[PDB]
């Protein structure tokens with residue numbers, strides 16, 4: 001604890017600064033300011049703050065080994081915090097816009113922002129645009145005279161682009177690639193020939209791992225001026241693997257976790273999603289199951305969903321998950337040893353990250 | 361001419377570079393690459409390219425007065441071009457997303473991107489996100505080692521934020537400020553007490569002038585290293601005024617220009633927009649007209665629209681437009697004289713801009 005309530009207080013000065021800049025510069029009336037205060041809180045708070053705290057943890061590690069003034073430690077911790085929020089604000093940006101795209105109902109127990117009676121799709125879309133816009137003013141204000149700014153903005157811009165690309169990958173995985181046409185309406189795949197592990201990993205990589213694990217870990221280094229004390233390739237590879245597992249957990253939970261516990265009602269089967277469950281099923285199933293899959297997958301009607309959820313329990317997908325989990329634990333622990341070669345404290349910060357995903 | 365076909369060719373290497381980066385780095389299959397090629401072309405091309413060419417024109421002015429190598433002139437012109445596209449790409453970003461928000465049908469004679477059979481609201485939203493994402497890679501690639509990068513990115517980020525803010529201002533102008541509540545559905549204004557010129561100018565300023573005139577003019581200076589050769593306050597003020605007029609033209613045209621000539625079917629009256637027409641009407645009308653306005657404005661039914669369009673012709677709004685146009689020509693020409701004090705060639709580039717708005 002402690003570091004979290006210190007991360008939460010940094011949110012408050014971000015929120016204050018942004019709304020002050022709006023008032024004193026952007027001619028905002030106290031009412032619209034109020035709207036944007038509630039907007040922020042609803043889309044940014046409520047979560048575990050796990051991605052943002054990751055910047056704080058990596059930064060916190062190096063303080064133990066590195067000699068800094070008291071005022072220096074406080075400067076680094078503060079930047080890790082603004083870095084933390086830059087990310088959660090980038091996520092809240094995507095979440096808001098992803099849910100409108102998907103057509104979601106619940107998220108963290110509460111309705112999706114656009115479903116708020118006095119928001120509407122018309123506003124939420126723009127609110128999303130503002131959320132990411134805010135990540136930039138944070139950067140330009142707080143890190144105005146930091147040597148890591150040009151690097152950090154550049155890392156941020158590319159991470160963002162990666163996420164947007166992966167968002168396209170995700171939303172187009174149910175129709176056939178060769179049939180993709182802006183002028184022809186997109187029909188659902190019948191053959192499911194693009195439900196491979198190679199295409200699946202391609203989706204997850206960009207749509208999640210980059211921003212959920214890469215961005216936070218490297219921002220931790222950036223704020224701590226320790227990018228020189230890691231092999232960057234190594235940092236890259238670990239984040240793509242721990243992040244892949246993160247989404248694989250999501251995919252399973254979706255299908256097999258009560259609405260109350262999940263925070264939402266999962267519709268990947270309805271949405272014809274290219275999930276871990278689907279890909280792994282089709283890498284296991286006999287022709288008779290495959291046919292009973294095609295004839296029932298990607299449909300809204302609960303009875304068709306039952307067939308799929310019934311199939312998965314019989315197809316024993318807890319088996320391959322275990323086998324996947326233990327192959328991940330295998331390669332994650334391998335990379336941490338490799339990390340200890342240049343950066344022992346970063347290695348154990350990555351280690352802390354792994355458990356914090358494995359455990360949850 | 362000439363400079364335009366040179367601006368269009370710079371688009372081609374931007375498009376090539378982006379799709380190459382996607383292929384060789386982002387693992388894009390030739391089909392999705394195709395989608396994003398068509399997306400770009402449809403949302404970026406078709407327009408007059410007037411905002412982007414403005415960077416080119418300002419840059420072109422200084423080449424006549426400033427001694428540069430041949431290879432230097434070509435470097436500056438090229439940056440003005442990538443600067444030009446950064447802006448048109450930022451606009452195409454907003455247009456795509458604005459039309460989804462408003463619920464539009466036509467734009468430049470062709471349907472709105474989301475209305476394309478094989479696009480859908482689900483994809484277009486993300487496509488919009490990518491369009492602005494592309495403005496950043498342009499910047500980071502082409503201007504990688506330019507002294508104006510930190511300035512230019514910072515100008516871009518703030519311009520963008522201004523536009524998003526103004527987008528909120530625009531979309532919330534039909535309901536009462538004190539009633540704004542994320543949890544209460546937004547009813548339309550009955551009193552229209554916020555249809556003032558002071559609130560109207562506040563909308564237009566942020567939602568248009570910043571990106572349509574400010575961004576292009578200053579980017580022209582940035583690429584030419586002549587930000588030191590202008591009073592920036594002066595450049596600011598002129599762009600907020602020529603841009604205000606630009607939107608005022610739009611507002612009139614909307615109501616009074618055939619669908620064929622306009623490129624779209626105007627529904628500001630249906631959309632209950634805070635237009636120049638409405639504001640100026642309520643600053644002119646007697647109580648009997650005002651009542652026949654309230655009872656007919658903000659409604660979809662064509663008969664109610666007829667009443668409003670009928671009122672405007674009788675309310676003689678060509679009068680106040682003339683009076684506005686000649687008060688604008690008045691203050692625009694004033695500022696150009698003031699501009700000639702420090703920057704004679706920029707002054708005449710601003711002058712070229714004014715006519716290119718007045719004429720069109």
Ligand SMILES: O=P(O)(O)C(CNC1CCCCC1)P(=O)(O)O
Nearest residue numbers: 094095098163167207208250251
């Ligand atoms: O949390 P979810 O389940 O809605 C996830 C939504 N994914 C987006 C998260 C934010 C960045 C883009 C992908 P997914 O359906 O992919 O599991």
Ligand SMILES: O=P(O)(O)C(CNC1CCCCC1)P(=O)(O)O
Nearest residue numbers: 454455458523527567568610611
């Ligand atoms: O060209 P339009 O008419 O759809 C304009 C849409 N405005 C947006 C343009 C792009 C930036 C945000 C405002 P407006 O309705 O405001 O006249």
Ligand SMILES: C=C(C)CCOP(=O)(O)OP(=O)(O)O
Nearest residue numbers: 046047048049050051091250
């Ligand atoms: C985006 C996904 C895949 C859901 C988790 O997001 P959260 O934002 O709720 O995660 P925490 O920050 O709460 O850990």
Ligand SMILES: C=C(C)CCOP(=O)(O)OP(=O)(O)O
Nearest residue numbers: 406407408409410411451610
């Ligand atoms: C955004 C508005 C107010 C409509 C004009 O946009 P365009 O993009 O069509 O303008 P040009 O670049 O064609 O001049």
Ligand SMILES: [Mg+2]
Nearest residue numbers: 098099102104
């Ligand atoms: Mg989703």
Ligand SMILES: [Mg+2]
Nearest residue numbers: 250251254268
């Ligand atoms: Mg899911």
Ligand SMILES: [Mg+2]
Nearest residue numbers: 458459462464
């Ligand atoms: Mg509009």
Ligand SMILES: [Mg+2]
Nearest residue numbers: 610611614628
């Ligand atoms: Mg209009």
